[PDB]
C-alpha cells in the first residue's frame, strides 16, 4: 500500500502539498518543500513586481487556527518564473505556480510569460481569484461578472490547462452560480477549495487588543475553525463540476481530516496553518495517518472512496 | 460592580439571552428561559402558519460546535403573539419576538399585528433576514436590494423601533454595503450579528457519512467554529452604525467569550449552541465568569469596556 496518483498528466507520490502562501515564499522555502515528503508544492501567489506586504504582526496562530492579513509579500513573478524554469527539480515532485495580479492586465501579462515554461517544464498554474477588484466591489471571486472576465482573459492569454483557487461560499445559490461560471471554461481543470475564511477578528482578552496590526485586526481565518466550511465547498464543487478536479484546502491537521476532504471529493489535499505550525515533518505524519485509516477500513486506493461521502436517505 | 443595562427603553439585569431558535420554540421552552437567570429571551423565528420543519436528524453538536438545517419548525405567529400579549411575565425580564416570513407580504402582515402588542406590552421585534428569498436566490440579507425592500416595507408597516438578525459577511465591501442599507432605516435600532455560518458540511469519518439529513448534509454552523467570524461582524457593524446598538451572537461558551463580544461592541450577548448543549444553567456560570474578569481588570460596568477593543497603532 502506497498513496501515489496521477493527474493533470503528472505523477504524485501522495496527495499532500502545502497551501499557497505557507512555506513557499523564498528559494529556501521552496527547496525545503521540495525536500519534504509532500507529493507536490505551490509557490506563494505573486505579483509582477515584488511586495513587502503589510506591517507586522500580520499572522497569528492559536489552538483552533490562524488569522492573517499578510498583504501578499512576495519576491515577484520574475523570481517564481526563474524558480520554475531553472531551479526546481521536477524529478522530485510537480510544481504549481500561483499568481494573483492586482488587475486583469497584470494577470494576462504574467500568464503569457508563464505559458512557454509550462510547455517546456510542466509547471502548473493556480490562479488566485481572491484578488483585488475595481472600486466598491468585493474580491474578484465574489463578483461573478469579474470572475467570468478574468477567466476569459486568462484562458485566451494562457491557452493551457490551469486551476483556480476559490474563496469559500456560504449560500447554495452562490455555489450554483460560481460553479456555472467555472464550467464555462474548459481550460480550468482543477478548482481548489478553499482560501481563508475572509475578515474574521481575533481579540486577546488579557490585553483587550486585536492580535494582528493591519486592517484594525481583521484577516483571513484558517485551521480548525474552517474545516466544515472547507468540506462544504469541496463537495459543492465536486458535485457541480464533474469534468474538473477539486483540490481540498482548509483545516487539515491529521490524516483523518485529509480522509474527510477526499471523501468530500478532493484529489489533492493542501495544508496551510498546520504546516505553518508544525513544519514540513507534518507530511510524513499525514501520509502515515491516512494510510492507517485506509488499512483499518480495507481501502487500497484513494479512488475507492474519493467523493463517496454518504448522505442520509 | 454590575451587569445591568438599560436600552431600547427596557432594563436588563445582565446582557445574556438565548439565541433565536434555541430553547424558545414552545410555551414550555419560553417559560424555562423566563425562569432562567438570562437578562432576556427571544422566541423562535416564526412564520404565519405553523411548520414541522425538516426531517431528522437536523441538528448535531460536536466539541467545536454545531450544524443545523432545522427548516424553521415553529408553532406559528398566533402562538408567539399570544405568548407575548397574554402569557409572558414582563416583570421577570424583557421579551424579543423573532419573525422570519417567506415573503415581504407575510412579514408585513405579521408586523402589522405585532405592533399594538409591542406598544402595549413592550415586546421587541427581531426580524430575521436570513429568510429564503425566491428559491435560487441567496438568502434575503445576501441580496441587498431585497433586503432594502423588506426593511422599507417592514418599517412602514410596523412604525416602531425594531432590530434585525444578520448573517455573517466575509468581505469588507459587504460590510460596507450592508451597513449602508441598515443606516437607511432609522427604526432599525439594533443589529444582531450573527446568524449561523451558512452551508457548512460535517462529515463523520467512521461512518463516511454526513451527520444531518436535509440538504445532503449541508447546514449552518454555530459554536467555537464561528467566534472570530462573529466578533468581526459585531465590530464591523459597531464601527459602521453609530446610531444603532449591536447585539453579539456566535461562539459564546464562557464569560471570556462574552467579554470579547462586548469589547467588539456588543450590548446584548446571545448564546445558541452552548445553551443547546449545556442547558439554562449556563446563564449563572456566564454571569459569574464575566464578573470575575471585570473584577480582575477593575471594571465596574459594561460601558467601561463596550466597544473599546484596541488596535495595534
Ligand atoms: C500566512 C498565510 C499566507 C497565505 N498566502 C496565500 C497566498 O499567497 N495565496 C493563496 O491562494 N492563499 C493563501 N493563503 C491561504 C491558504 O493557502 C489556505 O487557503 C488557508 O490558510 C486555509 O487552509 P488552512 O486551513 O490549512 O490554513 C495563505 C494563508 C496563510 C495562513
Ligand atoms: C437549532 C438552531 C436553531 C436556530 N434557529 C434560529 C432561528 O429560528 N432564527 C434565528 O435568527 N437564528 C437561528 N439560529 C441561529 C442562532 O440564533 C445563532 O445565530 C447561531 O447558532 C450562532 O450562535 P452560536 O454560535 O451561539 O450557536 C439557530 C441555531 C440553531 C443551532
Ligand atoms: O497575502 C495574504 O494576505 C493572503 N492571505 C490569505 O489567506 N489568502 C490570500 O489569498 C492572500 C493574498 C490575497 C491578495 C491577492 C492579490 C493581491 C493582494 C492580496 C492581499 F493580500 F493584499 F490581500
Ligand atoms: O430553522 C433553521 O433552519 C434556521 N437555522 C439557523 O441556524 N438560522 C436560521 O435563521 C434558521 C431559520 C432560517 C429560515 C428562516 C425563514 C424561513 C425558513 C428558514 C429555513 F430554515 F427554512 F431556512
From Swiss-Prot, chains A, B:
A biological process from GO: 'de novo' UMP biosynthetic process
Temperature dependence: Optimum temperature is 37 degrees Celsius.
Residues reported to bind FMN: 20, 44-45, 128, 165, 194, 223, 250-251, 272-273
UniProt key word Oxidoreductase: yes
Activity profile over pH: Optimum pH is 7.
Result of altering residue 1 to T: In allele DHOD3
Catalysis performed (reactions): (S)-dihydroorotate + fumarate = orotate + succinate
Enzyme class: oxidoreductase
GO MF term (any one): dihydroorotate dehydrogenase (fumarate) activity
InterPro entries assigned to the protein according to its UniProt record, in alphabetical order: Aldolase_TIM, DHO_dehydrogenase, DHOD_1A, Dihydroorotate_DH_1_2, Dihydroorotate_DH_cat
Keywords: Cytoplasm, Flavoprotein, FMN, Oxidoreductase, Pyrimidine biosynthesis
Any one cellular-component term (Gene Ontology): cytoplasm
Catalytic machinery residues: 131
Top-rank lineage group of the source organism: Eukaryota
Enzyme Commission code: 1.3.98.1
Pathway: Pyrimidine metabolism; UMP biosynthesis via de novo pathway
Self-association and partners: Homodimer.
Entry function: Catalyzes the conversion of dihydroorotate to orotate with fumarate as the electron acceptor. Molecular oxygen can replace fumarate in vitro.
Record family assignment: Belongs to the dihydroorotate dehydrogenase family. Type 1 subfamily.
Record protein name field: Dihydroorotate dehydrogenase (fumarate)
Organism of derivation: Trypanosoma cruzi (strain CL Brener)
Lineage, uppermost ranks: Eukaryota, Discoba, Euglenozoa, Kinetoplastea, Metakinetoplastina
Originating gene: pyr4
Amino acid at each position: 500500500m502506497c498513496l501515489k496518483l496521477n493527474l493533470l498528466d503528472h505523477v504524485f507520490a501522495n496527495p499532500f502539498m502545502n497551501a499557497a502562501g505557507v512555506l513557499c515564499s523564498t528559494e529556501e522555502d521552496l527547496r525545503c518543500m521540495t525536500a519534504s515528503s509532500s507529493g507536490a508544492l505551490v509557490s506563494k501567489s505573486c505579483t509582477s513586481a515584488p511586495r513587502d506586504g503589510n506591517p507586522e504582526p500580520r499572522y497569528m496562530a492559536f489552538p483552533l487556527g490562524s488569522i492573517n492579513s499578510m498583504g501578499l509579500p512576495n519576491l515577484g513573478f520574475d523570481f517564481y518564473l526563474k524558480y520554475a524554469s531553472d531551479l526546481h527539480d521536477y524529478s522530485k515532485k510537480p510544481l504549481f505556480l500561483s499568481i494573483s495580479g492586482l488587475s486583469v492586465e497584470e494577470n494576462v501579462a504574467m500568464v503569457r510569460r508563464l505559458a512557454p515554461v509550462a510547455q517546456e517544464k510542466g509547471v502548473l498554474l493556480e490562479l488566485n481569484l481572491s484578488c483585488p477588484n475595481v472600486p466598491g466591489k468585493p474580491q474578484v471571486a465574489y463578483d461573478f461578472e469579474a470572475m467570468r472576465t478574468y477567466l476569459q482573459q486568462v484562458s485566451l492569454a494562457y491557452g493551457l490547462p490551469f486551476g483556480v483557487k476559490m474563496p469559500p461560499y456560504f449560500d447554495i445559490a452562490h455555489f450554483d452560480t460560481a460553479a456555472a461560471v467555472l464550467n464555462e471554461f474548459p481550460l480550468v481543470k482543477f478548482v481548489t477549495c478553499v482560501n481563508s475564511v475572509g475578515n474574521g477578528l481575533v481579540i486577546d482578552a488579557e490585553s483587550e487588543s486585536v492580535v494582528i496590526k493591519p486592517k484594525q485586526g481583521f484577516g483571513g481565518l484558517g485551521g480548525k475553525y474552517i474545516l466544515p466550511t472547507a468540506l462544504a465547498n469541496v463537495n459543492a464543487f465536486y458535485r457541480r463540476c464533474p469534468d474538473k478536479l477539486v483540490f481540498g484546502c482548509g483545516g487539515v491537521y491529521s490524516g483523518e481530516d485529509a480522509f474527510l476532504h477526499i471523501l468530500a471529493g478532493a484529489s489533492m489535499v493542501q495544508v496551510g496553518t498546520a504546516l505553518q505550525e508544525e513544519g514540513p515533518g507534518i507530511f510524513t505524519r499525514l501520509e502515515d495517518e491516512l494510510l492507517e485509516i485506509m488499512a483499518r477500513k480495507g481501502y487500497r486506493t484513494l479512488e475507492e472512496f474519493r467523493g463517496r461521502v454518504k448522505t442520509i436517505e
